[model samples]
Target: QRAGPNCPAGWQPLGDRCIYYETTAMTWALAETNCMKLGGHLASIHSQEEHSFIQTLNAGVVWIGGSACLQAGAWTWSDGTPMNFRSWCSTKPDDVLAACCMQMTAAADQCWDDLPCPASHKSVCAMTF
Candidate 1:
C-alpha cells in the first residue's frame, strides 16, 4: 500500500487512493491548478469515510475540489469524478447563487462547507487507484 504506483512514498494512502496535501492557502480555482501542477486535481471525496480520513489529515479548512454551478444547478468535482457521495454542513452552502466552493472544515468534523470560490484555503489532491 505504501509503495504502489498510484501512491508514492510521499503520499498518504487510503483504500486504493492517495492524497497530496497543499498547505498553502489558495483560491479554489488556484487550488485546482496547484493540484494539476503536482500531477492531480483537488481531492474529490467519494464517501463520508474518505471525508473523515481527510479530517484526520487536515487541522483546518482545505479545498476539496467540489463547487456548485448554477448553470447545471448542481455541484461537481474538479476531478471529473461523479457525484456519488457528499458530506455537507447541515446549514451551510448558502452561497449557491454565487457559485459556492466546497471545503473540509476541521472544527466541524470535516463536514463540507460551501463558500465563495474566490477565497483561498489549503487543499488536497486525489490520486485514486
Candidate 2:
C-alpha cells in the first residue's frame, strides 16, 4: 500500500512521479503488465534528467515505455503519451520494422533502443504523484 499519494513502499520519489526499477527479468509485454498491476505504467521519460535518473538505478539493460506497436517509426509511451524526446544510439532502432518495444541500453550513453517485445529484460515503472 502507498504511504501517500506520491509513492508506495520501495518506490523512489522524483518530482511529481514515483519510480520503481524492477530487477526481475521479463518480456516487455510482461513487464508492462506487471507495472499496471502495481498501479503504474512502464516509465515514460521525457527529459535528460529523467533518463539520467533511470540510468542510475540499473547497470544492465532495462525496459521503458516507448514503443512503436501501432505503426513503425511512430513511438509512443505505454500511457499513450507522444514521444517528444529521444535518445537513440548511433546504430539503434536498427531493425525498426521488427523491433516494436523500447529499452534504455546499458551503454555509456544510456540511449534508447527498439527491441522485440518478447526480448527479456528488467523494467522501470512510474506513477504520477
Candidate 3:
C-alpha cells in the first residue's frame, strides 16, 4: 500500500504524514535540500510508530531530519521544530563536533545514531496533508 487520497502521488501514507524514501545515497545536507525541493523536509520521527514505519523501507542507514548544528548539544528538526521524541542507540551522539546529524541505523534492533553531516546515506522525506 502507498499513499492515501490526501497524499501527493507516489508518497506513502503513514498515519497523518506522507513519506518518501529516497534510495540514492547523498550527504545529509544534500538530502535535505532535495526534500525541500520536493516541498517537504527530511523526515522528523515523533513516535515509535513513525520510526518503525520508516525503518521498514530501508535496511541501511537512512537520514532523518534532526541535527544539532545550530548549537552543538541542542538538536532540532530541519523544519525548525524541537525534537520531542528520540530512539538513540546507547553511546550515541557521542562526538559533538563530527556527529551533528541524525540517522536511523538498520541494525537488528533499530536505533538512532548521530553521524557526520557529510556522510552519504539514503533519506526519508515527510510532509503533512
Candidate 4:
C-alpha cells in the first residue's frame, strides 16, 4: 500500500516522515545540507517517545542539530529555535573540542551525545511537515 509523502532520492519513509540513513556515510555538514536540499533540516527531538523511535530505526551514531554558532554554547536547530528537550547522555562532551555533532545513544534511551563532526556514522534526515 502507498504510505505517506514521497521521500527524497536515496531516502526511506519511517514514522511520520522520510529519512535517509546514509549507510555509505557522510560528514555532519554534508548530511545536514543533504537534508536541507530535500526540504528539511537535520532531525530535532520533540519528545522522549519520538527520540526513542528514531534510535530504534538506526541503532548507532547519527548526526543531529549541534552546529557551532559564533557564540559558544549557543547551538540550536537550523531554524533558530532553541533546543528545549535536551537528552544528553552522561560523561558526554567532556572534551567539547571533540564533540561538535549530535547523535543518539541507542534505541532504549531518550538522550543524545556529542561526537566528532567528521565521524562517518549513519545520519538522519526528516521530510517537511
Q: Which one wins on TM-score?
A: 3
Q: Rate the local accuracy (lDDT) of all candidates.
A: 0.63, 0.67, 0.68, 0.61
Residue 73's lDDT within candidate 1 is: 56
- Candidate 3 C-alpha lDDT tens digits along 1-129: 864476766567766657777777776677778777777777666666868776777645777657775564676665486665553546464756766677666775756677767767777777877
Could you estimate the TM-score for every candidate?
A: 0.65, 0.70, 0.71, 0.64
Q: Distance from true position, residue 10, model 2, in Å?
A: 8.3
- Backbone clash tally for model 3? 0
Judged by lDDT, which candidate is best?
Answer: 3
Q: Going through the candidates in order, what is the number of backbone clashes in each?
A: 0, 0, 0, 0
All candidates: CA RMSD (Å): 4.3, 3.9, 4.3, 4.4
Superposing every Cα of model 1 onto the true structure, what RMSD results?
4.3
> Which stretches in model 3 have alpha-carbon errors above 4 Å?
1-17, 70-72, 91-93
Tens-place lDDT digits, model 2, residues 35-126: 77777777666666977776776646777656775664565666476666553546464655566766666677656666777767777777
Model 4 weakest 10-residue run by lDDT: 86-95
Q: What does candidate 4 score on TM?
A: 0.64
**Cα error, candidate 1, residue 72 (Å):** 5.6
